[PDB]
Amino acid sequence: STGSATTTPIDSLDDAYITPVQIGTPAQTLNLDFDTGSSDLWVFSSETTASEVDGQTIYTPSKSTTAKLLSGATWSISYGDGSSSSGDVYTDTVSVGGLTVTGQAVESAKKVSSSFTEDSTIDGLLGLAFSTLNTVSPTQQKTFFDNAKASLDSPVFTADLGYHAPGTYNFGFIDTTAYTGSITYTAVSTKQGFWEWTSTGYAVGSGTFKSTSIDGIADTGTTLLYLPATVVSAYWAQVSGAKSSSSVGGYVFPCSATLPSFTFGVGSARIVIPGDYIDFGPISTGSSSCFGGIQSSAGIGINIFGDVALKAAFVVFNGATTPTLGFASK
């Protein structure tokens, strides 16, 4: 089997991407944030505290003839941005782009943190990291990809995120018309539960490539590119007037600036992030200070190849017995 679904930016900045997902019988379609940096499929639901729902579409398990409470199971998750959610668990039929999994754990939110309530465009998350990170207790549950894997034509999914435009998540096949050149594959460590890999270096604009190992994670659920402070300083030093602002929370730059590109290495190959992709717009409405799309990871503990980086590539998440990542230009 295969599946193919369009993913759409939630706003004009590409802060996140939503992908329609069919849950239950008859189908309830929710728009979920596909997150290769986490491993829970959770949804706003009829069980979510009413004051914490503001415009999201909810899953109502009592209206699904295939829903079954997973007795005793609870979940609770915290994300790198400080947001969180928790609740109980049903199993139900879940379909993405024509690919159907029966008995998928659907984690129903009883509580969500304010940032989720305040974003009416995201009805939940669909985790695509390794199932070892799934938070369901006392019986850890598998991700949608893990459950689908055996049925797929090939044990892979691909992320083709758009810049200010829709893109595609495919399951079970590699669309050879969706990229240019060849796909360069690179080794993955699953020791932390992530799609963790080592970039071979970087360049700023037309500058020379610096060969240096940068370990980080391919994370579709993180907006920005978080890299070591040395690398980030080298980038922003090429933007007149850019500076790190403690009060704003990162590097800002004059909105009148033209940003240089940023290149990262994948083996001997190179992925170029155009300068435009690094502009996240005014820090507040009407400001002439703009927020940068490349930020320091120094306070995170891990480097994160988020959407800023991934949207410049066609990305293969190869879930074979020994997982690998592939990157192609497009």
PDB file of C-alpha atoms in Angstrom, residues 42-248:
ATOM      1  CA  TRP A  42      -3.019  13.170  19.797  1.00  0.00           C
ATOM      2  CA  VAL A  43      -6.135  15.165  19.011  1.00  0.00           C
ATOM      3  CA  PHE A  44      -8.455  17.783  20.361  1.00  0.00           C
ATOM      4  CA  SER A  45     -11.558  15.867  21.330  1.00  0.00           C
ATOM      5  CA  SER A  46     -14.974  15.878  22.928  1.00  0.00           C
ATOM      6  CA  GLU A  47     -13.031  15.198  26.149  1.00  0.00           C
ATOM      7  CA  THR A  48     -10.900  18.358  25.949  1.00  0.00           C
ATOM      8  CA  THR A  49     -11.653  20.894  28.695  1.00  0.00           C
ATOM      9  CA  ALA A  50     -14.163  23.170  27.000  1.00  0.00           C
ATOM     10  CA  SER A  51     -12.372  26.416  27.898  1.00  0.00           C
ATOM     11  CA  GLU A  52      -9.235  25.063  26.178  1.00  0.00           C
ATOM     12  CA  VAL A  53     -10.962  24.557  22.805  1.00  0.00           C
ATOM     13  CA  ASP A  54     -11.156  27.649  20.590  1.00  0.00           C
ATOM     14  CA  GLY A  55     -12.014  26.832  16.984  1.00  0.00           C
ATOM     15  CA  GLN A  56     -10.277  23.465  16.542  1.00  0.00           C
ATOM     16  CA  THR A  57     -12.072  20.514  15.018  1.00  0.00           C
ATOM     17  CA  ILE A  58     -12.539  17.805  17.634  1.00  0.00           C
ATOM     18  CA  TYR A  59     -12.582  14.015  17.511  1.00  0.00           C
ATOM     19  CA  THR A  60     -15.668  12.540  19.205  1.00  0.00           C
ATOM     20  CA  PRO A  61     -14.986   8.838  19.853  1.00  0.00           C
ATOM     21  CA  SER A  62     -18.594   8.156  20.850  1.00  0.00           C
ATOM     22  CA  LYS A  63     -19.592   8.943  17.249  1.00  0.00           C
ATOM     23  CA  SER A  64     -17.113   6.443  15.771  1.00  0.00           C
ATOM     24  CA  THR A  65     -18.334   2.863  15.525  1.00  0.00           C
ATOM     25  CA  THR A  66     -14.725   1.616  15.396  1.00  0.00           C
ATOM     26  CA  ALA A  67     -13.420   3.527  18.431  1.00  0.00           C
ATOM     27  CA  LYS A  68     -12.506   1.532  21.519  1.00  0.00           C
ATOM     28  CA  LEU A  69     -11.238   2.920  24.807  1.00  0.00           C
ATOM     29  CA  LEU A  70      -7.727   1.615  25.527  1.00  0.00           C
ATOM     30  CA  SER A  71      -8.510   0.786  29.112  1.00  0.00           C
ATOM     31  CA  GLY A  72      -6.221   2.325  31.708  1.00  0.00           C
ATOM     32  CA  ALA A  73      -4.008   4.101  29.188  1.00  0.00           C
ATOM     33  CA  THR A  74      -3.004   7.719  29.690  1.00  0.00           C
ATOM     34  CA  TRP A  75      -0.550  10.031  27.979  1.00  0.00           C
ATOM     35  CA  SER A  76       1.224  13.277  28.749  1.00  0.00           C
ATOM     36  CA  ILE A  77       3.728  15.107  26.584  1.00  0.00           C
ATOM     37  CA  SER A  78       5.829  18.251  26.731  1.00  0.00           C
ATOM     38  CA  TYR A  79       7.400  19.778  23.643  1.00  0.00           C
ATOM     39  CA  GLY A  80      10.612  21.721  23.157  1.00  0.00           C
ATOM     40  CA  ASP A  81       8.694  25.009  22.964  1.00  0.00           C
ATOM     41  CA  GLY A  82       7.231  24.502  26.443  1.00  0.00           C
ATOM     42  CA  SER A  83       3.766  23.462  25.258  1.00  0.00           C
ATOM     43  CA  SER A  84       2.091  20.311  26.569  1.00  0.00           C
ATOM     44  CA  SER A  85      -1.022  18.159  26.452  1.00  0.00           C
ATOM     45  CA  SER A  86      -2.367  15.037  28.148  1.00  0.00           C
ATOM     46  CA  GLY A  87      -5.349  12.715  28.242  1.00  0.00           C
ATOM     47  CA  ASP A  88      -6.593   9.178  27.661  1.00  0.00           C
ATOM     48  CA  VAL A  89      -6.421   6.837  24.676  1.00  0.00           C
ATOM     49  CA  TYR A  90      -8.697   5.177  22.145  1.00  0.00           C
ATOM     50  CA  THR A  91      -7.865   2.839  19.319  1.00  0.00           C
ATOM     51  CA  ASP A  92      -9.541   3.616  16.014  1.00  0.00           C
ATOM     52  CA  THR A  93      -9.081   3.500  12.265  1.00  0.00           C
ATOM     53  CA  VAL A  94      -6.817   6.256  10.956  1.00  0.00           C
ATOM     54  CA  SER A  95      -6.240   7.039   7.284  1.00  0.00           C
ATOM     55  CA  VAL A  96      -3.738   9.435   5.720  1.00  0.00           C
ATOM     56  CA  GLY A  97      -3.899  10.146   2.015  1.00  0.00           C
ATOM     57  CA  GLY A  98      -5.587   6.814   1.289  1.00  0.00           C
ATOM     58  CA  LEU A  99      -3.379   4.697   3.584  1.00  0.00           C
ATOM     59  CA  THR A 100      -5.391   3.058   6.380  1.00  0.00           C
ATOM     60  CA  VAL A 101      -4.237   1.714   9.752  1.00  0.00           C
ATOM     61  CA  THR A 102      -6.680  -0.132  11.967  1.00  0.00           C
ATOM     62  CA  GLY A 103      -6.190  -0.165  15.712  1.00  0.00           C
ATOM     63  CA  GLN A 104      -4.125   3.021  15.786  1.00  0.00           C
ATOM     64  CA  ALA A 105      -3.727   4.622  19.187  1.00  0.00           C
ATOM     65  CA  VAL A 106      -5.520   7.965  19.060  1.00  0.00           C
ATOM     66  CA  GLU A 107      -4.595   9.972  22.135  1.00  0.00           C
ATOM     67  CA  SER A 108      -7.555  12.111  23.172  1.00  0.00           C
ATOM     68  CA  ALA A 109      -6.629  15.363  24.895  1.00  0.00           C
ATOM     69  CA  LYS A 110      -8.287  16.157  28.172  1.00  0.00           C
ATOM     70  CA  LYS A 111      -5.962  19.135  28.672  1.00  0.00           C
ATOM     71  CA  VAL A 112      -3.857  21.231  26.305  1.00  0.00           C
ATOM     72  CA  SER A 113      -1.583  24.167  27.056  1.00  0.00           C
ATOM     73  CA  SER A 114      -2.418  27.714  26.032  1.00  0.00           C
ATOM     74  CA  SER A 115      -0.390  27.760  22.822  1.00  0.00           C
ATOM     75  CA  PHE A 116      -2.482  24.878  21.457  1.00  0.00           C
ATOM     76  CA  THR A 117      -5.777  26.521  22.437  1.00  0.00           C
ATOM     77  CA  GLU A 118      -4.628  29.779  20.840  1.00  0.00           C
ATOM     78  CA  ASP A 119      -3.876  28.119  17.482  1.00  0.00           C
ATOM     79  CA  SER A 120      -7.213  27.264  15.919  1.00  0.00           C
ATOM     80  CA  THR A 121      -5.602  25.769  12.793  1.00  0.00           C
ATOM     81  CA  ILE A 122      -3.979  22.695  14.424  1.00  0.00           C
ATOM     82  CA  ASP A 123      -6.330  19.953  15.621  1.00  0.00           C
ATOM     83  CA  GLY A 124      -3.563  17.747  17.018  1.00  0.00           C
ATOM     84  CA  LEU A 125      -0.231  16.145  16.218  1.00  0.00           C
ATOM     85  CA  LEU A 126       0.769  12.997  14.344  1.00  0.00           C
ATOM     86  CA  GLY A 127       4.147  11.848  15.561  1.00  0.00           C
ATOM     87  CA  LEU A 128       6.616  10.291  13.137  1.00  0.00           C
ATOM     88  CA  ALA A 129       9.706   9.829  15.326  1.00  0.00           C
ATOM     89  CA  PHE A 130      10.533   6.404  16.728  1.00  0.00           C
ATOM     90  CA  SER A 131       7.910   4.644  18.828  1.00  0.00           C
ATOM     91  CA  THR A 132      10.318   4.441  21.777  1.00  0.00           C
ATOM     92  CA  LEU A 133       9.370   8.101  22.464  1.00  0.00           C
ATOM     93  CA  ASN A 134       5.620   7.446  22.648  1.00  0.00           C
ATOM     94  CA  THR A 135       4.284   8.623  26.011  1.00  0.00           C
ATOM     95  CA  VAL A 136       1.323   6.253  26.494  1.00  0.00           C
ATOM     96  CA  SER A 137       1.418   4.516  29.872  1.00  0.00           C
ATOM     97  CA  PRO A 138       1.442   1.767  31.021  1.00  0.00           C
ATOM     98  CA  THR A 139       1.649   0.241  27.517  1.00  0.00           C
ATOM     99  CA  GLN A 140       3.633   2.282  25.011  1.00  0.00           C
ATOM    100  CA  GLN A 141       1.929   2.612  21.628  1.00  0.00           C
ATOM    101  CA  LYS A 142       3.216   2.601  18.064  1.00  0.00           C
ATOM    102  CA  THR A 143       3.229   5.515  15.654  1.00  0.00           C
ATOM    103  CA  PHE A 144       1.073   5.584  12.549  1.00  0.00           C
ATOM    104  CA  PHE A 145       4.156   4.876  10.433  1.00  0.00           C
ATOM    105  CA  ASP A 146       5.242   1.970  12.630  1.00  0.00           C
ATOM    106  CA  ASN A 147       1.765   0.430  12.363  1.00  0.00           C
ATOM    107  CA  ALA A 148       1.614   0.978   8.590  1.00  0.00           C
ATOM    108  CA  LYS A 149       5.184  -0.076   7.815  1.00  0.00           C
ATOM    109  CA  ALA A 150       4.634  -3.771   7.133  1.00  0.00           C
ATOM    110  CA  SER A 151       1.807  -3.029   4.681  1.00  0.00           C
ATOM    111  CA  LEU A 152       3.692  -0.329   2.759  1.00  0.00           C
ATOM    112  CA  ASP A 153       5.267  -1.072  -0.609  1.00  0.00           C
ATOM    113  CA  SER A 154       8.531   0.219   0.880  1.00  0.00           C
ATOM    114  CA  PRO A 155       9.100   1.075   4.570  1.00  0.00           C
ATOM    115  CA  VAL A 156       9.563   4.801   3.981  1.00  0.00           C
ATOM    116  CA  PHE A 157       7.833   8.132   4.170  1.00  0.00           C
ATOM    117  CA  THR A 158       8.854  11.380   2.528  1.00  0.00           C
ATOM    118  CA  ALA A 159       8.443  15.027   3.479  1.00  0.00           C
ATOM    119  CA  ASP A 160       8.271  17.625   0.698  1.00  0.00           C
ATOM    120  CA  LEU A 161       7.396  20.832   2.511  1.00  0.00           C
ATOM    121  CA  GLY A 162       6.619  23.964   0.521  1.00  0.00           C
ATOM    122  CA  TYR A 163       7.963  27.481   0.916  1.00  0.00           C
ATOM    123  CA  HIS A 164       4.852  29.643   1.306  1.00  0.00           C
ATOM    124  CA  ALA A 165       2.987  26.892  -0.558  1.00  0.00           C
ATOM    125  CA  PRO A 166       1.503  23.427   0.010  1.00  0.00           C
ATOM    126  CA  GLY A 167       3.648  20.320  -0.130  1.00  0.00           C
ATOM    127  CA  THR A 168       3.297  16.565   0.241  1.00  0.00           C
ATOM    128  CA  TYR A 169       3.754  13.713   2.695  1.00  0.00           C
ATOM    129  CA  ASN A 170       4.020  10.348   0.953  1.00  0.00           C
ATOM    130  CA  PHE A 171       4.010   6.920   2.605  1.00  0.00           C
ATOM    131  CA  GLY A 172       5.410   3.769   1.068  1.00  0.00           C
ATOM    132  CA  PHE A 173       7.042   5.141  -2.085  1.00  0.00           C
ATOM    133  CA  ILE A 174       9.556   7.686  -3.347  1.00  0.00           C
ATOM    134  CA  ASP A 175       8.126  10.040  -5.999  1.00  0.00           C
ATOM    135  CA  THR A 176      11.058  10.342  -8.387  1.00  0.00           C
ATOM    136  CA  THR A 177       9.398  13.347 -10.088  1.00  0.00           C
ATOM    137  CA  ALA A 178       9.455  15.388  -6.873  1.00  0.00           C
ATOM    138  CA  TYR A 179      13.174  16.198  -6.697  1.00  0.00           C
ATOM    139  CA  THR A 180      16.127  17.081  -8.886  1.00  0.00           C
ATOM    140  CA  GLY A 181      19.400  15.237  -9.111  1.00  0.00           C
ATOM    141  CA  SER A 182      19.950  12.318  -6.772  1.00  0.00           C
ATOM    142  CA  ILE A 183      19.008  11.553  -3.181  1.00  0.00           C
ATOM    143  CA  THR A 184      21.983  11.400  -0.818  1.00  0.00           C
ATOM    144  CA  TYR A 185      21.432   9.019   2.076  1.00  0.00           C
ATOM    145  CA  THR A 186      23.071   9.420   5.458  1.00  0.00           C
ATOM    146  CA  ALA A 187      23.212   7.353   8.627  1.00  0.00           C
ATOM    147  CA  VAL A 188      20.670   7.731  11.434  1.00  0.00           C
ATOM    148  CA  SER A 189      21.068   7.107  15.151  1.00  0.00           C
ATOM    149  CA  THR A 190      17.859   6.095  16.918  1.00  0.00           C
ATOM    150  CA  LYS A 191      19.479   6.154  20.374  1.00  0.00           C
ATOM    151  CA  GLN A 192      17.466   9.224  21.431  1.00  0.00           C
ATOM    152  CA  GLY A 193      14.315   8.222  19.537  1.00  0.00           C
ATOM    153  CA  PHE A 194      14.813  10.864  16.823  1.00  0.00           C
ATOM    154  CA  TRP A 195      15.782  10.914  13.165  1.00  0.00           C
ATOM    155  CA  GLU A 196      19.258  11.960  14.294  1.00  0.00           C
ATOM    156  CA  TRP A 197      22.014  12.384  11.719  1.00  0.00           C
ATOM    157  CA  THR A 198      25.290  14.249  11.192  1.00  0.00           C
ATOM    158  CA  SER A 199      25.584  17.057   8.670  1.00  0.00           C
ATOM    159  CA  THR A 200      29.009  17.418   7.090  1.00  0.00           C
ATOM    160  CA  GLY A 201      29.204  21.215   7.355  1.00  0.00           C
ATOM    161  CA  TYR A 202      27.862  24.524   6.160  1.00  0.00           C
ATOM    162  CA  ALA A 203      28.366  27.628   4.079  1.00  0.00           C
ATOM    163  CA  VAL A 204      26.990  31.153   4.436  1.00  0.00           C
ATOM    164  CA  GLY A 205      25.919  32.787   1.182  1.00  0.00           C
ATOM    165  CA  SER A 206      28.588  32.444  -1.495  1.00  0.00           C
ATOM    166  CA  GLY A 207      31.236  31.749   1.149  1.00  0.00           C
ATOM    167  CA  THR A 208      33.487  28.731   1.349  1.00  0.00           C
ATOM    168  CA  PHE A 209      32.104  25.505   2.750  1.00  0.00           C
ATOM    169  CA  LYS A 210      33.239  24.709   6.291  1.00  0.00           C
ATOM    170  CA  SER A 211      33.646  20.965   6.774  1.00  0.00           C
ATOM    171  CA  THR A 212      32.522  20.174  10.318  1.00  0.00           C
ATOM    172  CA  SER A 213      30.283  17.516  11.834  1.00  0.00           C
ATOM    173  CA  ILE A 214      26.943  18.829  13.082  1.00  0.00           C
ATOM    174  CA  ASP A 215      24.788  16.219  14.819  1.00  0.00           C
ATOM    175  CA  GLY A 216      21.110  17.093  14.789  1.00  0.00           C
ATOM    176  CA  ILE A 217      17.571  15.881  14.226  1.00  0.00           C
ATOM    177  CA  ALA A 218      15.273  16.104  11.212  1.00  0.00           C
ATOM    178  CA  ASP A 219      12.170  17.610  12.853  1.00  0.00           C
ATOM    179  CA  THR A 220       9.149  18.645  10.786  1.00  0.00           C
ATOM    180  CA  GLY A 221       7.424  19.806  13.955  1.00  0.00           C
ATOM    181  CA  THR A 222       9.971  22.568  14.655  1.00  0.00           C
ATOM    182  CA  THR A 223       9.648  25.758  12.588  1.00  0.00           C
ATOM    183  CA  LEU A 224      13.236  26.991  12.601  1.00  0.00           C
ATOM    184  CA  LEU A 225      16.808  25.802  12.099  1.00  0.00           C
ATOM    185  CA  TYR A 226      18.683  25.561  15.426  1.00  0.00           C
ATOM    186  CA  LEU A 227      22.454  25.186  15.139  1.00  0.00           C
ATOM    187  CA  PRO A 228      25.553  25.729  17.279  1.00  0.00           C
ATOM    188  CA  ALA A 229      26.210  29.306  18.353  1.00  0.00           C
ATOM    189  CA  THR A 230      29.417  29.491  16.305  1.00  0.00           C
ATOM    190  CA  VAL A 231      27.566  28.616  13.092  1.00  0.00           C
ATOM    191  CA  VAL A 232      24.662  30.955  13.819  1.00  0.00           C
ATOM    192  CA  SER A 233      27.001  33.842  14.642  1.00  0.00           C
ATOM    193  CA  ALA A 234      28.841  33.289  11.362  1.00  0.00           C
ATOM    194  CA  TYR A 235      25.544  33.466   9.471  1.00  0.00           C
ATOM    195  CA  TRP A 236      24.158  36.617  11.080  1.00  0.00           C
ATOM    196  CA  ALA A 237      27.504  38.409  10.873  1.00  0.00           C
ATOM    197  CA  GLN A 238      26.792  38.618   7.134  1.00  0.00           C
ATOM    198  CA  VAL A 239      23.565  40.607   7.719  1.00  0.00           C
ATOM    199  CA  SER A 240      24.174  44.289   8.480  1.00  0.00           C
ATOM    200  CA  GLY A 241      22.421  45.251  11.691  1.00  0.00           C
ATOM    201  CA  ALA A 242      21.542  41.709  12.784  1.00  0.00           C
ATOM    202  CA  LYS A 243      21.989  40.990  16.474  1.00  0.00           C
ATOM    203  CA  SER A 244      20.927  38.550  19.147  1.00  0.00           C
ATOM    204  CA  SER A 245      18.197  40.054  21.333  1.00  0.00           C
ATOM    205  CA  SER A 246      17.659  38.515  24.765  1.00  0.00           C
ATOM    206  CA  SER A 247      14.360  40.382  25.107  1.00  0.00           C
ATOM    207  CA  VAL A 248      13.000  39.092  21.810  1.00  0.00           C
TER     208      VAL A 248
END
